[PDB]
Amino acid sequence: NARVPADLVIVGDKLVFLEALERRVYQATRVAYPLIGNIDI
Amino acid sequence: AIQQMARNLRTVLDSFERGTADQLLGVLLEKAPPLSLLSPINKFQPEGH
Secondary structure, X not given: OOOXXXXXXXXXXXXXXXXXXXXXXXXXXXXXXXXXXXXXX | OHHHHHHHHHHHHHHXXXXXXXXXXXXXXXXXXXXXXXXXXXXXXXXXX
């Protein structure tokens, strides 16, 4: 294994990763980031 | 006369060190966009085009 700087949070009883990957990937490129999805009402 | 000479020349030499900060404030005011217009463009459009 290798050490990687990444933040982990605890919710309920489960230890989960917390990712908001927008600076490492999807940055200074021509693609649209997902999770900016659209809805119709 | 020479006392007034030296006392005057000292403040004249000090004035450049005193006014360089004025020139940086002038150029930084002439450069900076407003935050209310800089921050939504940096966020609300992802990339551009």
